[PDB]
């Protein structure tokens, strides 16, 4: 292990959540850069977030230069740790930047290891955003939090779009482009994002069901994926209809305003 | 093999099945050698041929062949770039 002894002493306590040892270690030590690594290639912050420890994650976030913050956010969103998500969103790195909204694949030059995982690639697909991942996992609290910050799933372009961006993404890694479209639609078709996304979500779900059925007929390779998403939308609509227990609510769902 | 066949031929066949159930395991398949998808494909074919040959433990060998096929398909499923799909679909 290339790591030295002091940073190992730091990381063991950070992983196992011993608040005072980590606090004493990172307070005024000349060495012990917080961006150090571990046996599995992980980080102090990622080991702290992997096993829910709001205190350790907060005291690590106090440090100005901390690496792999976006990976920690995606790991917290993957789980139900809403407090850790709030803490990481309160970080000044997210506040004054566009990093939260746009995907890790196309956010910036990406020289910084903002969303990086161990060494080679991101934890999840490079197309998945924090909000798309929250919709995938169906975390209602996290979806609402990310929607408050203005992070919304961008509806993918039409299949036959010929804009310069879609053509450029089609030239290289057309498979990855199709996979990213499917991820965006699986995020949009999530009951969490459907309910918390917009006013009148039953009409949104019906229209998205129709759109996904048409794209299932068009693609014909990922037909089963799009049909599953269309069934998700149909089930959401039927579930919203089922909860009605007055005639006024039934009338409101059966015909709009 | 002849000596092991003379006494306890049943135990010999059982030991062969145990060795193949160890080889066809996703753990040993992944951690055993470089390029494990080709290893799993070849082992799937070998286990299918031995299922046709034995005919007493046909179901055991068919289960192991299905294990190998499932491992190959699972490794293929995880691809999320076109380069990885191309690498799995054709070797080096
Ligand atoms: Zn376009
Ligand atoms: Zn022999």
Swiss-Prot record, chain B:
Disulphide bonds in the chain: none
Compartment annotation: Cell membrane
Free-text tissue specificity from the UniProt record: Expressed predominantly in brain and at much lower levels in ovary, colon, small intestine, lung, prostate, placenta and testis.
Linked pathology: Spinocerebellar ataxia 41: A form of spinocerebellar ataxia, a clinically and genetically heterogeneous group of cerebellar disorders. Patients show progressive incoordination of gait and often poor coordination of hands, speech and eye movements, due to degeneration of the cerebellum with variable involvement of the brainstem and spinal cord.
Protein purpose: Forms a receptor-activated non-selective calcium permeant cation channel.
Family stated for the protein in its record: Belongs to the transient receptor (TC 1.A.4) family. STrpC subfamily. TRPC3 sub-subfamily.
Domain notes: The cytoplasmic portion of the protein is required for channel assembly and gating.
Subunit note: Homotetramer. Interacts with ITPR1. Interacts with ITPR3. Interacts with MX1. Interacts with RNF24. Interacts with JPH2; the interaction is involved in maintaining Ca(2+) homeostasis in skeletal muscle and is mediated by JPH2 'Ser-165' phosphorylation.
Name the record gives this protein: Short transient receptor potential channel 3
Species this chain originates from: Homo sapiens
Lineage, top ranks: Eukaryota, Metazoa, Chordata, Craniata, Vertebrata
Part of the intact protein present: 272 to 363 of 921
């Amino acid at each position: 292990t290339s790591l030295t002894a002091e940073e190992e002493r730091f990381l063991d306590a950070a992983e196992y959540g011993n608040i005072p040892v980590v606090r004493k270690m990172l307070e005024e030590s000349k060495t012990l850069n917080v961006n150090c690594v571990d046996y599995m290639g992980q980080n102090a912050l990622q080991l702290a977030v992997g096993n829910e420890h709001l205190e350790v994650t907060e005291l690590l976030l106090k440090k100005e230069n901390l690496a792999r913050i976006g990976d920690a956010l995606l790991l917290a969103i993957s789980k139900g740790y809403v407090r850790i998500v709030e803490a990481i969103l309160n970080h000044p790195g997210f506040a004054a930047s566009k990093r939260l909204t746009l995907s890790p694949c196309e956010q910036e030059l990406q020289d910084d290891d903002f969303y990086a995982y161990d060494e080679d690639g991101t934890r999840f697909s490079p197309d998945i955003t924090p909000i798309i991942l929250a919709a995938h996992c169906q975390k209602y609290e996290v979806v609402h939090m990310l929607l408050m910050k203005g992070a919304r799933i961008e509806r993918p372009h039409d299949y036959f779009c010929k804009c310069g961006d879609c053509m450029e993404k089609q030239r290289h890694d057309s498979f990855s482009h199709s996979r990213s479209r499917i991820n965006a639609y699986k995020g949009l078709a999530s009951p969490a994002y459907l309910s918390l996304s917009s006013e009148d979500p039953v009409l949104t779900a019906l229209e998205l069901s129709n759109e996904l059925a048409k794209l299932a007929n068009i693609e014909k390779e990922f037909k089963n994926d799009y049909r599953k998403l269309s069934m998700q939308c149909k089930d959401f609509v039927v579930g919203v209809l089922d909860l009605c227990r007055d005639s006024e609510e039934v009338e409101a769902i059966l015909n709009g305003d």
